[PDB]
Amino acid sequence: AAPPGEAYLQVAFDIVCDNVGRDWKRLARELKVSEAKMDGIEEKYPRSLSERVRESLKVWKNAEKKNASVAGLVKALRTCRLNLVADLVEEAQES
């Protein structure tokens, strides 16, 4: 059901998570992720970058479908302000 190509996206979600990890919560609110999920992850995890972003990133990744590829998130994150993760996925792809 979710993006079957989660393997490639998961690699990008890994370098970017440990880099701008807190900015996914910022993007999660923009993506209108389940408010209930944020309530549990935020309250349960007061300082875990991995714990808060993973749940919020999981729901966003499922709704992305074709946008589950980096071209989707890298285009959006860098155009707005997340140049940090853009540089990460960028050098990873070499191009």
Swiss-Prot record:
Residues 9-93 form the Death domain. It is found in: Cytoplasm. Contains a death domain involved in the binding of the corresponding domain within Fas receptor. Apoptotic adapter molecule that recruits caspases CASP8 or CASP10 to the activated FAS/CD95 or TNFRSF1A/TNFR-1 receptors. The resulting aggregate called the death-inducing signaling complex (DISC) performs CASP8 proteolytic activation. Active CASP8 initiates the subsequent cascade of caspases mediating apoptosis. Involved in interferon-mediated antiviral immune response, playing a role in the positive regulation of interferon signaling. Can self-associate. Component of the AIM2 PANoptosome complex, a multiprotein complex that drives inflammatory cell death (PANoptosis). Component of the death-induced signaling complex (DISC) composed of cell surface receptor FAS/CD95 or TNFRSF1A, adapter protein FADD and the CASP8 protease; recruitment of CASP8 to the complex is required for processing of CASP8 into the p18 and p10 subunits. Interacts (via death domain) with FAS (via death domain). This is FAS-associated death domain protein. It comes from Mus musculus (Mouse). The gene is Fadd.
